[model samples]
Target: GTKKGVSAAAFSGVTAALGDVGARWFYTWAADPQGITAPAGTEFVPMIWGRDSVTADQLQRAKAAGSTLLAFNAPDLAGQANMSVETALDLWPQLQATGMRLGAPAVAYGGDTPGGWLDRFMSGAAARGYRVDFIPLHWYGGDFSAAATGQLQSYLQAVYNRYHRPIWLTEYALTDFSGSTPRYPSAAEQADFVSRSTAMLNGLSFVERYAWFSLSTSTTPTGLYTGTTPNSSGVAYRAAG
Candidate 1:
């Protein structure tokens, strides 16, 4: 059962069902707020972010409610909306003080400019004793030839060699934005992309995870996952899994 806006009574029912099914995580956007504690052996992993203040009391309550991990997206280094790398570095002390492990799904890019900033930021993080568990990147543009994929993989390999951090491809999809006459890859083509990419990356010792863009879609068909009828590509992804 989903926990979207679940009330205390409804949470009890959900928890009971989870007990019978032997589930672990509740998959809520965040941990419950009604103080409805998780059943024994369950572990909550709240989706937190750089902008959110991870207070001690909140951390205490999360742990008491059976939370073992707090998966947070790293600060994006884009334009005005970006969080300063300095702020992320400063927060390390506080994060470590709570005795909690930190992780990030980082954004990567090509060329020299963004890479320079990443190097500086990563250096700062290393000085502060922050070990990135995973460094994530995104791929969006149209399909490229094997040569092109090789070049892109070369760049990714360079980053991996430099940091020695495991890689997690956090986002990727084919879209019509490029205005290519062929349009986004068909379901079969997309599935091939997943299979090829997974095989290629899984061969690398530094790559540890590869999650599809999503599980379901909503009124908008942009995400990997759709809420309505499952897209062909989504079905392909499941089949690959």
Candidate 2:
């Protein structure tokens, strides 16, 4: 198992506090962990969100900065980066040439399904002899029940069983957002979910690294930190290490 990580688009001022919360890495949507000052003993990785988000030039720069490359943000969703399977397949070659350990395109949802976006992309990669060193996943549980804990772990196991690759859950939480707006779990509920989820993930050998969505705010109720202090979820998450 690797160290814990976080997906933070912005953490300029409070990044120093990441050490307090046990963050080993951070990633923005760009090809680098730009715009944020990382605390000591931590680094950032690059992610290619769309066709235009990164070029060969940018990939080289990021690879020179470090090895591992993340491809695509949410090609499965229409509102997010919204990249199509064909488009993602088209751009994958350049990403492969970088020779960095590569993570599969991080889809918004349905990664374990046969005809889902990630399924299609994986099928295409197999056909073309492309390389995807690991699987990057994002999950959100709309249900706040203890059963949602099982659902979360089940999805992780299902995807890992399907791919047999190292799993990196880049974003996940115990809230449902399938409605009009974000519906969050209570602080205690969120903390419990974090504890259970992190425990399950830590014991899984194929699980490489997992990152909660935010380290900045608990407004999503998933954030590990509120300003500079460890909130309920934050405390549970950090102690998991």
Candidate 3:
């Protein structure tokens, strides 16, 4: 299965760390792999991060990477992809024309809402017969309780019920940005979530793939590795299939 992946690459041996952690694939949030070559036998997924990323060269790079493509990063987020549904719909065909398998635009949140950004895009895609092979979603756990796993699964289930499409959890971790200052779970708690959530994701038939928030970063709080060394969460991620 292609269920295990990572979001970004950083530092030397990051790819090797991913390999060591049993990651089968990863993404760079861009068509370019950012000068990091994946170890042999590992897949590098390409993402069309925003409207400006929809270019011939990017498409060519995506084609050169693999057969699958992840669409806009967070179109619903102002500081991210930041595209109106009309703009996204207008740009859909150009990406569809690439002929690679395409995941839906990843929304920051509200994916299960009736009239949300992803909902509108999906509805429009249906009306226009646009292709969306799977749904890509991003999630962050605001609740640090033991029920966080259930919260994550419930969100995934709701989105699945609404769209009836396979899912790719492109980015996910235990961190809270709801307040002025960000909050993070303890390393032990993060490791616990990593172990449980990966198991839950693995058990779900509709979930085709998932990637941790990042590969290497001391600031992210959920980065699996630090310059090729597996942290607590990284070790837990590695122990998973």
Candidate 4:
């Protein structure tokens, strides 16, 4: 199966957008799919976004959404899940009880950095004998040059070397979200990155699945589709797999 997919938090005409991009799987960063149904041949993966997502209702909704579940989203980032390792561990059992294929909490970055959020979490899970079927990661490339592809691979390789686990690069795109003024590559640059990145991801046997940071432009210029219209990135994403 092709590893290409999208991170589709609900948006207008999202269903058609997903279809237009020919995505094979998707996640909404919540246990619920909101009202957007997956098109035929597409799978919907649910996520327990954060501490608030550990409730019984969310777990039930996640079970109904899919058999696999993504753990905390960017737990290391204050603007995202913002969860502490101890807190995540405390609440992990709630997610584990669902018996779904569980992915490790996706850190904002530095998945391979020593003593990073993910590193500590992995060690904690091991000590607790908790199950982590795969590693989920999020990356945004700051390099807009042709070297960006190699930089992306290097990061993933470092993470793989550290954990030696199957990886699900749950979110990735080419945007420098660092400074006050966030910079984006041109539409053509985004499309080219999508094509090249997807090809590289497909060739990596350890990368089980990957999704563009999003399917819609609500967040960044990197989205494959704008509403239901296929942009340059969308066209390349459709042809990627």
Candidate 5:
């Protein structure tokens, strides 16, 4: 199993519980601590956003603890998000000092018009001597309509071709939030959707990895796995994976 954005202590607990089955955790260290020990045979991958927030000490700690750190560029046009270029540049020395690889997300309209922002970001990174190992992107085809799905995939492939970099589909799913009431998908539909999406992604040469948006449901029906009961859709995805 691959996990992301969870705390180190929580990750340790998860590894302890699931390590026996060869489960692997992809941990994200966006806040503090910056490093953690992993269970034997488990791979610890760090997900970082702002470079300035990450220090050389933190990167050294992560490397010494046997962690692989991957940088993430999640732009926040709302001026509420973290991970700015200035922050990233400030943290670059630490990343270089720690020998950690770099990664960034595909530019979105909110941050920069889908196509234009990425080019600028990439050029800036290259000028600064940072090499992006992968280009990550998030997709939420709102209602999972065929048109929306097609458009998302098209955008992914187009970016891949233009950049010639491996792609990591960091997040994606069919949200159930239409207005206020929760919209749930049937088991068959859920299974079909995931399966088809996986197949489509598999056909793309540049897509190197794909991750489901979530493993469980939230209070409402917007999650993959429901909390109250085992939703058929959730069960189907578990079985498929």
Candidate 6:
């Protein structure tokens, strides 16, 4: 009922996916997940960097080698690709000519609103006769209550309703770190969101794929993993899909 084989995409002619350790598929943000070959049985899916980091060679090279391809990362945000909508559309013809499956350019936020980045981009693409295989989304929820899970579900549904296209939530987590101090839920709280969100995504036919924001966690209460071990949330991720 969903796309599998475990892999992951971009916007501004660029965008991004998730991780599977000790399994058949492994995804990373760079051309090399860890800048090394896949160990033995894992399939490696790479994200080719773009915007200021993009090069002509990288696009062709990625299409020639990588599994699924995406463009620009969070172009709507100042610190990210930060590309202009006009520029992205102008460049899409070249990307389309690549003749590979293309995921839409990702947005930093406001995907469900009428004038949001993704909304505007989608409208422009349709006007210009463009094609988008899927929509890539990044979500971070500041709430840690049972309400948090509902918030995530609401956002996903809003986006789906707006576009009526398949979705790929490449980055998602509970808690918001954009404030002066990072705000994170307890390990158990994060785990609840992970399992609940995964279950919803699994049952939704329009959701093509999804990945937690990280493959592993950290010394602090961040990321999905704690060192190499699966944190409470990480266990839920492993069980997903």
> For model 4, what is the C-alpha lDDT against the true structure?
0.87
Per-residue lDDT of 228 in model 3: 75
Provide the lDDT at 165 for model 3.
94
Q: How many clashes would you count in candidate 4?
A: 0
Question: Cα RMSD (Å) between model 3 and the true structure?
Answer: 1.1
lDDT of 3 by residue, 164-198 (tens): 99999998998899999989998888889999999
Off by over 4 Å in 6: 1-26, 31-34, 39-43, 218-221
What is the TM-score of candidate 4?
0.96
> Which ten-residue region of model 4 has the weakest summed lDDT?
217-226
Ranking the candidates on TM-score from highest down gives: 3, 4, 2, 6, 5, 1
lDDT of 4 by residue, 56-137 (tens): 9989989998999999989898899999999999999999999999999999888998898999999999999999999988
Candidate 2 vs candidate 5, TM-score winner:
2
Question: Clashes in model 4: which pairs?
Answer: none
Which scores better on lDDT, 4 or 6?
4
Error in Å for residue 193 of model 5? 1.9
Q: Scored by Cα lDDT, where does model 6 land?
A: 0.67
The stretch of ten residues in a row with the least summed lDDT in candidate 1 is: 1-10
TM-score of model 2 vs. true structure: 0.94
TM-score of every prediction relative to native: 0.64, 0.94, 0.97, 0.96, 0.69, 0.83
Candidate 1 C-alpha lDDT tens digits along 108-172: 45412444545766788778767655565555546443343454467668777777776655445
**Alpha-carbon lDDT of model 2:** 0.81
Q: Write the per-residue lDDT of candidate 5 for residues 1-241, one digit (tens) a residue.
A: 2322212333223344323222244344353333444556556555555535466565665676544555644563334234455555555555656655556643333322443556766767778887677777766665654454576677787777666787766666665545696455555655567656765765766676665555344423333443324455444344432
lDDT of 6 by residue, 5-33 (tens): 23322111101113343334545555544
Off by over 4 Å in 3: none
Higher-lDDT candidate among 5 and 6?
6
